[PDB]
Tab-separated table of C-alpha atoms in Angstrom:
chain	number	residue	atom	x	y	z
A	163	UNK	CA	76.844	116.589	140.225
A	164	UNK	CA	75.651	115.696	136.709
A	165	UNK	CA	77.344	118.766	135.224
A	166	UNK	CA	80.623	117.840	136.923
A	167	UNK	CA	80.528	114.368	135.333
A	168	UNK	CA	79.721	115.730	131.862
A	169	UNK	CA	82.607	118.194	132.071
A	170	UNK	CA	84.983	115.358	133.030
A	171	UNK	CA	84.033	113.398	129.904
A	172	UNK	CA	84.369	116.468	127.681
A	173	UNK	CA	87.834	117.156	129.135
A	174	UNK	CA	88.919	113.625	128.197
A	175	UNK	CA	87.571	114.018	124.660
A	176	UNK	CA	89.366	117.373	124.252
A	177	UNK	CA	92.669	115.811	125.360
A	178	UNK	CA	92.262	113.006	122.829
A	179	UNK	CA	91.638	115.416	119.972
A	180	UNK	CA	94.630	117.616	120.867
A	181	UNK	CA	97.014	114.635	120.893
A	182	UNK	CA	95.468	113.468	117.607
A	183	UNK	CA	96.035	116.846	115.938
A	184	UNK	CA	99.631	116.839	117.144
A	185	UNK	CA	100.503	113.376	115.762
A	186	UNK	CA	98.813	114.134	112.434
A	187	UNK	CA	100.740	117.400	112.041
A	188	UNK	CA	103.992	115.523	112.682
A	189	UNK	CA	103.070	112.922	110.067
A	190	UNK	CA	102.378	115.745	107.615
A	191	UNK	CA	105.659	117.494	108.462
A	192	UNK	CA	107.679	114.399	107.530
A	193	UNK	CA	108.981	114.415	103.945
A	194	UNK	CA	111.831	113.014	101.876
A	195	UNK	CA	115.466	113.305	103.060
A	196	UNK	CA	114.270	113.427	106.663
A	197	UNK	CA	116.442	111.705	109.313
A	198	UNK	CA	113.573	109.743	110.875
A	199	UNK	CA	112.297	107.701	107.923
A	200	UNK	CA	112.868	103.940	107.788
A	201	UNK	CA	111.187	100.730	106.715
A	202	UNK	CA	108.607	99.932	109.375
A	203	UNK	CA	107.627	96.509	110.617
A	204	UNK	CA	104.104	95.501	109.559
A	205	UNK	CA	102.888	98.970	108.516
A	206	UNK	CA	99.654	97.684	106.963
A	207	UNK	CA	98.351	96.114	110.181
A	208	UNK	CA	95.113	97.103	111.906
A	209	UNK	CA	95.376	97.579	115.693
A	210	UNK	CA	92.951	96.397	118.359
A	211	UNK	CA	91.078	99.719	118.438
A	212	UNK	CA	89.770	99.727	114.848
A	213	UNK	CA	87.057	102.343	115.273
A	214	UNK	CA	85.166	103.318	112.135
A	215	UNK	CA	84.315	106.844	111.024
B	270	UNK	CA	139.224	94.060	46.600
B	271	UNK	CA	136.631	91.681	48.086
B	272	UNK	CA	138.609	91.216	51.312
B	273	UNK	CA	139.056	94.933	51.956
B	274	UNK	CA	135.353	95.654	51.337
B	275	UNK	CA	134.338	93.118	53.979
B	276	UNK	CA	136.942	94.518	56.404
B	277	UNK	CA	135.607	98.076	56.077
B	278	UNK	CA	132.021	96.945	56.704
B	279	UNK	CA	133.000	94.997	59.825
B	280	UNK	CA	134.711	98.017	61.384
B	281	UNK	CA	131.639	100.184	60.700
B	282	UNK	CA	129.498	97.672	62.593
B	283	UNK	CA	132.073	97.666	65.428
B	284	UNK	CA	131.681	101.461	65.731
B	285	UNK	CA	127.890	101.358	65.933
B	286	UNK	CA	127.867	98.522	68.489
B	287	UNK	CA	130.259	100.420	70.786
B	288	UNK	CA	128.057	103.536	70.703
B	289	UNK	CA	124.974	101.473	71.593
B	290	UNK	CA	126.788	99.857	74.544
B	291	UNK	CA	127.734	103.259	75.992
B	292	UNK	CA	124.229	104.709	75.839
B	293	UNK	CA	122.704	101.534	77.264
B	294	UNK	CA	125.044	101.803	80.276
B	295	UNK	CA	123.717	105.322	80.851
B	296	UNK	CA	120.114	104.075	80.864
B	297	UNK	CA	121.083	101.238	83.238
B	298	UNK	CA	122.460	103.613	85.868
B	299	UNK	CA	119.387	105.888	85.645
B	300	UNK	CA	117.121	102.878	86.271
B	301	UNK	CA	119.306	101.811	89.184
B	302	UNK	CA	119.053	105.181	90.937
B	303	UNK	CA	115.258	105.297	90.576
B	304	UNK	CA	115.057	101.959	92.426
B	305	UNK	CA	116.593	103.540	95.540
B	306	UNK	CA	114.397	106.636	95.310
B	307	UNK	CA	111.299	104.417	95.323
B	308	UNK	CA	112.691	102.613	98.381
B	309	UNK	CA	112.885	106.001	100.138
B	310	UNK	CA	109.200	106.670	99.419
B	311	UNK	CA	108.365	103.214	100.810
B	312	UNK	CA	110.154	103.994	104.096
B	313	UNK	CA	108.220	107.261	104.379
B	314	UNK	CA	104.837	105.532	103.962
B	315	UNK	CA	105.654	102.837	106.533
B	316	UNK	CA	106.662	105.378	109.153
B	317	UNK	CA	103.555	107.496	108.506
B	318	UNK	CA	101.354	104.474	109.270
B	319	UNK	CA	103.231	103.506	112.404
B	320	UNK	CA	103.288	107.147	113.469
B	321	UNK	CA	99.509	107.353	113.303
B	322	UNK	CA	99.007	104.106	115.197
B	323	UNK	CA	100.010	105.697	118.567
């Protein structure tokens, strides 16, 4: 039972890191002359999460 | 003699002023295009931040 619970938490953490890698690779792939760039509303804000390193 | 000397000098100054006006227009348009390029870099930074906030 304990091993089942630990594997559930590790599955959630793995999903979070895969989605993170994907968004960061998209943000790297953006460059100049790209059709998705625009001026964004409040880009310097800090969201409610605000985890530190 | 005095009148024609002054006339020649005034046309020489006309020539030099016209050349300066032309080259200053060229520098004005180069400055104006670099404004819009810096605006493009600003848009890129804003969308990188709001991309990472998801």
